[PDB]
């Protein structure tokens, strides 16, 4: 898990989406210091094993001068970069031309644009079209359109109104993770339920991907669900990426989760009649929904400790 790394630059956003896992808004104050981010980016650019550095937020294009400065630190080291955005900047075709020219000269291999009914009150449809259309001139940048949907807001009209600008773009519609603003602003009956506590043989984490988050912590993945858990890989302020990777690979909870799946933790709670006590939901939109509910408090994580200790002595 040492070929890719992500930095969440800021919780500040121009939008205030009702589903946002971070509850991002123009008044969001959670972020790592700029100088600290410059040091992480310099270290990741100098690192011999890292191949891809991804930036996320918040809205990364909100402070474009700082994003371009971070992309320029990486440039001499020839690392690949990925970006994700709400495309607010697409309003001006000249601005789009400038940003695509910069991304192309700064080894940006992928750009994901998020647009759906939750993003629509904050960004015009025409702004997204401008970015999608200009991206045709840059075939080496992989373009994607991510649409977060609910049963009442399926984004069926958003796609029609995008017209032919979506031709050749990879579109993925996905359900909500019940975290951040989605917990309180969206009715749970509107969140699609694809999994239950009984089909445990399908609850396997897709894999680890290191994220240095805007709360100053380090997470083993970039799923919206992980940020509400107490699973952090940070032990000190100045921690190297080698140490982060060493901790990820020696974390007993994450090792058991990867090797045994969620059913190992769910069966412990069922055996000890702790499902109601831990507020484990019966149905969920995805596998990450189980993750968040198993580990979103220090009590929950610590609860598994003697069972994980028994696993370590028995195996290994």
């Amino acid at each position: 898990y040492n070929k890719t790394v992500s930095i969440n630059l800021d919780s500040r956003c121009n939008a205030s989406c009702d589903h946002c896992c971070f509850s991002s808004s123009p008044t969001s104050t959670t972020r790592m210091e700029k100088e600290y981010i410059r040091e992480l980016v310099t270290e990741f650019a100098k690192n011999k094993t890292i191949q891809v550095i991804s930036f996320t937020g918040g809205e990364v294009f909100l402070d474009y001068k700082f994003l371009k400065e971070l992309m320029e630190i990486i440039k001499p080291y020839e690392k690949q970069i990925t970006l994700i955005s709400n495309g607010f900047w697409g309003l001006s075709k000249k601005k789009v031309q400038e940003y695509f020219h910069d991304m192309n000269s700064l080894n940006v291999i992928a750009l994901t644009i998020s647009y759906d009914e939750y993003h629509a009150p904050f960004v015009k449809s025409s702004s997204i079209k401008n970015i999608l259309e200009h991206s045709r001139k840059y075939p080496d940048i992989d373009i994607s359109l991510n649409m977060a949907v609910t049963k009442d807001k399926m984004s069926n009209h958003i796609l029609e109104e995008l017209g032919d600008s979506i031709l050749g773009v990879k579109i993925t519609k996905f359900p909500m993770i019940s975290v951040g603003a989605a917990k309180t602003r969206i009715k749970q009956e509107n969140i699609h339920k694809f999994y239950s506590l009984e089909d445990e043989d399908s609850l396997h984490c897709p894999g680890y991907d290191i994220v240095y988050h805007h709360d100053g912590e380090i997470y083993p993945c970039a799923s919206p669900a992980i940020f509400e858990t107490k699973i952090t890989l940070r032990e000190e302020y100045n921690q190297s990426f080698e140490r982060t990777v060493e901790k990820l690979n020696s974390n007993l909870l994450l090792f058991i989760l990867r090797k045994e799946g969620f059913k190992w933790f769910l069966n412990i709670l069922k055996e000890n009649n702790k499902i109601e006590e831990f507020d484990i939901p019966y149905e969920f939109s995805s596998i990450c929904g189980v993750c968040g509910s198993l580990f979103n408090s220090a009590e929950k994580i610590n609860y598994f400790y003697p069972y994980m200790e028994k696993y370590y002595n028995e195996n290994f």
Binding site: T82, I109, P206, S223, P224
Partner: peptide, 11 residues
């Protein structure tokens, strides 16, 4: 994929 949900990713 879930592990790269809040990130841009190449095809």
């Amino acid at each position: 994929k879930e592990n790269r949900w809040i990130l841009g990713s190449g095809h």
